[PDB]
Design a protein around this ligand. Structure first.
Ligand SMILES: *[C@@H]1O[C@H](CO)[C@@H](O[C@@H]2O[C@H](CO)[C@@H](O[C@@H]3O[C@H](CO)[C@@H](O)[C@H](O[C@H]4O[C@H](CO)[C@@H](O)[C@H](O)[C@@H]4O[C@H]4O[C@H](CO)[C@@H](O)[C@H](O)[C@@H]4O)[C@@H]3O)[C@H](O)[C@H]2NC(C)=O)[C@H](O)[C@H]1NC(C)=O
Ligand SMILES: *[C@@H]1O[C@H](CO)[C@@H](O[C@@H]2O[C@H](CO)[C@@H](O)[C@H](O)[C@H]2NC(C)=O)[C@H](O)[C@H]1NC(C)=O
Ligand SMILES: *[C@@H]1O[C@H](CO)[C@@H](O[C@@H]2O[C@H](CO)[C@@H](O)[C@H](O)[C@H]2NC(C)=O)[C@H](O)[C@H]1NC(C)=O
Ligand SMILES: *[C@@H]1O[C@H](CO)[C@@H](O)[C@H](O)[C@H]1NC(C)=O
Ligand SMILES: *[C@@H]1O[C@H](CO)[C@@H](O)[C@H](O)[C@H]1NC(C)=O
Ligand SMILES: *[C@@H]1O[C@H](CO)[C@@H](O)[C@H](O)[C@H]1NC(C)=O
Ligand SMILES: *[C@@H]1O[C@H](CO)[C@@H](O)[C@H](O)[C@H]1NC(C)=O
Ligand SMILES: *[C@@H]1O[C@H](CO)[C@@H](O)[C@H](O)[C@H]1NC(C)=O
Ligand SMILES: *[C@@H]1O[C@H](CO)[C@@H](O)[C@H](O)[C@H]1NC(C)=O
Ligand SMILES: *[C@@H]1O[C@H](CO)[C@@H](O)[C@H](O)[C@H]1NC(C)=O
Lengths: 97, 96, 129, 270, 124, 53, 125
């Protein structure tokens, strides 16, 4: 199980990784299963969480398989684990500030 | 004692993944920009279509692993790319 | 595909019926199932070719079955019997358990483990004979 | 360790008229398209009234988000389809058993469009969905329709097309209620720098035409999305993966291959 | 299989059964459109002429004699079906005159001729 | 004697089909036949064939 | 449509002779594709009508449908009687086709009559 650390306010890079690099629809959820990001075709769709305007992904990297989650302005409340859903691979990554 | 027969015309089917077309009802004089595309990649329709109801048969359908959708998502991407031609695109490359 | 494309849909008419009542009507149905301006003309011809690139495809798909029936002896016969003994290792079911309480689709879920072996045995049995 | 360049292709761009026509989907000889005539079809599982036909009905490729314009109507009741309800990441398709007509026009600021939809026909038709939603959700929970949550402008607003002009209608005054046990206007803004739904990458178009722009359509669909928390359920709409637009019209079709060559044992000879 | 295949309707049926088995600028920039459009008319006629042959090989297959030209069967004639003396209807009579005679019974011959194969399918 | 069946026999009965019309036109003259004879017509037959029977 | 596969051995032909049927956006040049769409489709109806006109010959000689049929017309000695061993060993089907020049026209003439003799034999019992 992977883990990452931040201080405060910075930008992290929590990455999923697919197997074929052809833009499979992914997601990102917290421990309580609230949506964070997610592909919708070729658009982007955030979820009704506390990170509703402080999260992003690099749109050019979705064609190369990697679906990063970039969280700007790390507060103290977002210390959690975060779970991809690419096809079935719930790749969990825990973050602490 | 019992011997193998052969029959031709038995109601059997499998689950294949062929490449179907569109065959819409285009007019071939319009410039609706669908009728420009549907006159080239789609044949005329059939005016007396065939529809055979069946007996007591329960087919196990599916809706979320259907593969007619990937042959509609291609022919509409290949519609809009020749219909709504833009002025400036910005498509990334990102070579390794 | 108006010629021999409506024939292949008519094969699936009695699906889900029992195996005896579906094989009994093969002879009956096949006799009945076999029954421009300036800008227009360079587009109305591609609508005449593409309606023949599939109608011919209904012909050479139908003749790729009579080339297959003709290898196993009988060509042109719908119901046809062959000099190859039915092994009980395909299915261990009596004929009372077959032509009375089964539909044709259940055979593809039963002998398709063996259905390429039967096609080889039907080859030599009308090759040397 | 990677970095990405962004190209810039430049075609010749006129103002092309653009309305969708019904497009069937037939197959070649040797195949068949089965068709589920069950008027209560969940989407998956065994359909009992299977018919056999060549191609389906004239499916109009109407690209939209947050709604499904000009589609086809259910037979009896509002249907609700998903690959896995309580997955929280699967888009709940919803059909309608009635058309909710929507007048959405640009009168004679050139990027300004109101969008009239009746509050009588919408409050009934949004009420029928709450019956069919409590069937899967316990018959005692509160159902709350929020507006959207973040993302690009194409998925957070009812983005569609109308005569070549890419409308962007704000539907916050369409899903706003909270359910317990005359005509709305929507501020659409024609845009010129849009995102593409085909691939990843922006597109910049011509300025809009001079004159009136009109398109009266039937909202015959929805793409909602639950927000499973920790009690009431918050159903905010969504969309964007355009396969789900056409999944809701190829939903009762399957492509099979006829294999008419049977080998059965009998007691024949020769 | 063709459509202009038998334009050899002579006189003797006995001779007809013998040959039953033996079988520059007009353009104005539009001569590639005359040959393309009427190319389709010579293809919609040939393909339908194939599918008439295959529609009839299934009908000769129900009578058992498929893939063969002269089909000899196991059912006799009658008196209602123009009971001639086998000289006036085989050496001096054209096929068109013979087809016009038994046209009242061609739909009646075809019913029993199917049944004469089903009896030969009972001994199998 | 016995019923025998022949294939390829030279007989024809009669027909009541819908014939299509040729009428080689010009397609740019504003005469009212030349604007009709491109609406519901075809180019005339290049290299026609006629067999004597 | 039934073509060949490279020839190159008489004996290895007859093993693979069966398997050839035993198992299986432009919008700018609308004359380059419409003329060559007919000429590539006139060559697919001819490949059907040459098959039906050649199952008609094998229907005359009683060999209708069978790829490798066997018939009762004996070898004359005057049809290039070579060694029957090495014909199947090291020879192509092209090289054998040169080995009979004008006997093919008279081989076919017996098979039309030997079936008609067999037509006058099966109906004379
Ligand atoms: C759901 O289905 C409905 C039913 O079809 C769709 O509604 C249709 O929408 C189209 C356009 O979106 C509309 O077509 C217009 O009809 C007018 C009435 O005849 C036409 O006059 C008009 O043509 C003009 O506009 C085009 C736009 O580019 C021009 O290309 C065209 O040449 C005409 O342009 C003249 O007028 C304009 C000003 O409008 C001016 O700028 C030009 O210079 C020129 O003078 C359109 O063809 C249909 O009428 C609508 N259907 C109905 C029944 O009303 C709806 O779009 C569908 N929903 C979705 C999301 O697609
Ligand atoms: C639908 O999706 C949900 C959410 O992913 C699945 O439910 C959870 O599945 C995980 C498997 O990793 C279990 O550990 C949880 O206990 C499940 N939770 C609940 C509330 O059921 C569910 O299995 C999916 N349904 C189907 C049919 O696949
Ligand atoms: C879409 O419309 C809604 C309202 O219809 C906008 O949301 C807010 O609405 C209230 C009044 O209802 C305003 O006072 C606020 O200024 C609006 N904005 C916010 C951020 O609260 C919403 O902003 C509209 N969407 C867009 C993209 O303009
Ligand atoms: C459907 O099932 C019933 C129940 O046995 C049966 O009687 C009927 O014949 C079936 N339908 C058909 C068309 O065979
Ligand atoms: C849909 O309904 C069928 C019963 O018709 C059921 O078997 C299946 O599990 C349901 N699927 C979902 C996703 O609810
Ligand atoms: C909508 O309908 C519900 C019940 O039918 C009602 O409670 C509510 O007041 C209605 N709202 C409006 C705006 O009419
Ligand atoms: C919801 O309503 C249906 C029909 O009205 C009923 O069958 C079901 O039991 C109800 N659910 C409950 C009470 O949880
Ligand atoms: C949703 O509604 C809230 C409050 O009404 C508003 O602040 C927000 O901007 C709205 N978002 C959209 C996308 O309409
Ligand atoms: C809306 O639905 C009606 C029937 O309910 C139909 O007649 C009309 O054409 C539809 N409008 C469209 C498809 O734009
Ligand atoms: C035509 O009739 C003449 C005179 O009866 C006869 O000699 C000739 O053989 C006939 N030819 C054909 C082709 O029927």
């Amino acid at each position: 199980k992977k883990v990452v650390l931040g201080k405060k306010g910075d930008t992290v890079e929590l990455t999923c990784t697919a197997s074929q690099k052809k833009s499979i629809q992914f997601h990102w959820k917290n421990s309580n299963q609230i949506k964070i990001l997610g592909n919708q075709g070729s658009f982007l769709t955030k979820g009704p969480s506390k990170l509703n305007d402080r999260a992003d992904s690099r749109r050019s990297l979705w064609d190369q398989g990697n679906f990063p989650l970039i969280i700007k302005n790390l507060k103290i409340e977002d210390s959690d684990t975060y779970i991809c859903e690419v096809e079935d691979q719930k790749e969990e990554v825990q973050l602490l500030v | 004692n019992l011997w193998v027969t052969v029959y031709y015309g038995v109601p059997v089917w499998k689950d294949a993944e062929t490449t179907l077309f569109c065959a819409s009802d285009a007019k071939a004089y319009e410039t609706e920009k669908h009728n420009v595309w549907a006159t080239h990649a789609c044949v005329p329709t059939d005016p007396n279509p065939q529809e055979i109801h069946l007996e007591n048969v329960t087919e196990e359908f599916n809706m979320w692993k259907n593969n007619m959708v990937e042959q509609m998502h291609t022919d509409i991407i290949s519609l809009w790319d020749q219909s709504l031609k833009p002025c400036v695109k910005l498509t990334p490359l990102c070579v390794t | 595909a108006v010629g021999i494309g409506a024939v292949f849909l008519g094969f699936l008419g009695a699906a889900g019926s029992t195996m005896g009542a579906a094989s009994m009507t093969l002879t009956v149905q096949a006799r009945n199932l076999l029954s421009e301006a300036q800008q227009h003309l360079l587009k109305l011809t591609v609508w005449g070719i593409k309606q023949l690139q599939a109608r011919v495809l209904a012909v050479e798909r139908y003749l790729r079955d009579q080339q297959l029936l003709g290898i196993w002896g009988c060509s042109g016969k719908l119901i046809c019997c062959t000099n190859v003994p039915w092994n009980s290792s395909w299915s261990n079911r009596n004929l009372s358990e077959i032509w009375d309480n089964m539909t044709w689709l259940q055979w593809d879920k039963e002998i398709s483990n063996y259905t390429q072996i039967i096609y080889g045995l039907l080859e030599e049995s009308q090759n040397q004979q | 360790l990677i970095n990405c360049n962004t190209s810039a292709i430049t075609q010749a761009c006129p103002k092309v008229s653009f309305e969708p026509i019904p497009i069937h989907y037939c197959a070649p000889a040797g195949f068949a398209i089965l068709k589920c005539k069950d008027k209560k079809f969940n989407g998956t599982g065994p359909c009992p009234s299977v018919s056999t036909v060549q191609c389906t009905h004239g499916i109009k490729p109407v690209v939209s988000t947050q709604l499904l314009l000009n589609g086809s109507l259910a037979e009896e009741e509002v249907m609700i389809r998903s690959e896995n309800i309580t997955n929280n990441a699967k888009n709940i398709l919803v059909q309608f058993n009635t058309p909710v007509q929507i007048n959405c026009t640009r009168p004679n600021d050139i990027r300004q469009a109101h969008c009239n939809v009746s509050k009588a026909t919408w409050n009934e038709t949004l009420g029928k969905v709450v019956k069919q939603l409590r069937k899967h959700f316990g018959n005692n929970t509160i159902i709350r329709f929020a507006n959207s949550s973040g993302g690009d402008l194409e998925v957070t607003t009812h983005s569609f097309n109308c005569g070549g002009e890419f409308f962007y209608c704000n539907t916050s005054g369409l899903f706003n209620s909270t359910w317990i046990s005359d005509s709305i206007t929507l501020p659409c803004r024609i845009k010129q720098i849009i995102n593409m739904w085909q691939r990843i990458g922006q597109a910049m178009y011509a300025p809009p035409i001079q004159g009136v722009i009109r398109c009266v359509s039937n909202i015959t669909g929805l793409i909602l999305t639950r927000d499973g928390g920790s009690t009431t359920e918050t159903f905010r709409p969504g969309g964007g993966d355009m396969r789900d637009n056409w999944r809701s019209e190829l939903y009762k079709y399957k492509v099979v291959k006829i294999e008419p060559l049977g080998v059965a044992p009998t007691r024949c000879k020769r």
